[PDB]
Amino acid sequence: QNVGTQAAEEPLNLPISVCTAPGNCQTEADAVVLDSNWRWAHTTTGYTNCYTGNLWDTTLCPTPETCTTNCAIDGVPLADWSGTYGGSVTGNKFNLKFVTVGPYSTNIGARTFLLDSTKTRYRMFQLLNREFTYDVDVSSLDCGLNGALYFVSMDADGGAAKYPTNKGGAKYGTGYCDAQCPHDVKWINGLANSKDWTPIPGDANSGKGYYGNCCAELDIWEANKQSQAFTTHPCTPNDQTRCEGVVCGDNDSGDRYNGMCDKDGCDFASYRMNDHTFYGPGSTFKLDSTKPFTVVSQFITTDGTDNGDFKEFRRFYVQNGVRIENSKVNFPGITAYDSITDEMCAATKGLFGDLDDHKNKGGMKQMGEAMRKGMALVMSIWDDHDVNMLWLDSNYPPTGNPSTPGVARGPCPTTSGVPSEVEVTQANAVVSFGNIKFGPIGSTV
């Protein structure tokens, strides 16, 4: 995309801490940028929309190459972050509102990325043999909503170096890809994704174009107050790849397990792994989701070095000063795993009857190659038009028997999560991600 002249791009400052040992950290002066999907797209030398609601203007955008010539994406000034998009920062805490009813329109959901101290590139994290940690508040997110923090194998400059027609790069939140190979990305490989664009029924704001955009993804946190998961999604290859046909692994053509990305990923979700009491909204759960807590993630390698292969994603929590170890897998004949490993993935997927696409895509080792190259940090809040978040917090499939291992993922009703309902009932939901810390293992708490 070209860049417009109607509004200055002003990302929100967000300090994080880079640590060398327990309680010994230095501030890093980073900032948050809005994904280019949420930006106003209009004529390059005027005011006229190129995209409105969930459609491209067919006169300005008869083809992607003409679309891209005629149109531009514009900036988000400070005032609009809060007024239009519902983003704000207080000290080292970032807050994202699910629904923001602005002056002249309504915004639903948000995806944002962390920029480095220059505000010119994404802050890339090389996660192998490191620990990443943050404080979270999800007490106001219920069934159907997801406040997610995760990493993806985006390019640090948004693709600007590879794609000449991308003039915005990271400064305009360009280049989003993930292991779902999404077709709802509006700009891919520096071009409008306007070919064969189709609105999403029941989503006034989105559609799906001809291409998708795939890359590896490491989900640190997929959650609401009812259920939470962490998940590895390798791809072959791991880097940003525009896809079409079977390579995207589209759910709608029966191709979920035929594409380049592991779509299901290898998940550790406490409730699905059969500990219903570990996490939930109340003081008698082990971890109380009505209150804020710290989430620690350790990326362990085969040799304890930056050069080894990734072998294990470990997790623990701290809440009101109390260290809380992860829950464990709880099924007869299955070892009580408390972390993600290749072995854990094969045992659990074998029990659940799930295809081990994680292993087919090269497993922990392949996931770690992505982490070694460096991944971008994403913070988002969203509802789910395809499956109503039932995969995260209910029975999936909803017709499945919940005593069958793998089906039950949380206590929410199978009728929950309908976007038109949650956008009313949960209009005030807000996720907070704060006090981010990154360092060697053992250094962040």
TrEMBL record:
GO terms for biological process: cellulose catabolic process; glucan catabolic process. This is cellulose 1,4-beta-cellobiosidase (non-reducing end). It catalyses: Hydrolysis of (1->4)-beta-D-glucosidic linkages in cellulose and cellotetraose, releasing cellobiose from the non-reducing ends of the chains. GO terms for molecular function: cellulose 1,4-beta-cellobiosidase activity. Its EC number is 3.2.1.91. The modification Pyrrolidone carboxylic acid is found at Q1. Keywords: Carbohydrate metabolism, Cellulose degradation, Glycosidase, Hydrolase, Polysaccharide degradation, Pyrrolidone carboxylic acid, Signal. It comes from the Eukaryota. InterPro entries: ConA-like_dom_sf (IPR013320), Glyco_hydro_7 (IPR001722), Glyco_hydro_7_sf (IPR037019). Gene3D superfamilies: Glycoside hydrolase, family 7, domain. Belongs to the glycosyl hydrolase 7 (cellulase C) family. Disulfide bonds join C19-C25, C50-C71, C61-C67, C143-C412, C177-C215, C181-C214, C235-C261, C243-C248, C266-C345. Pfam families: Glyco_hydro_7. The gene is CEL7A. The keyword Cytoplasm does not apply. It is an enzyme of class 3 (hydrolase).
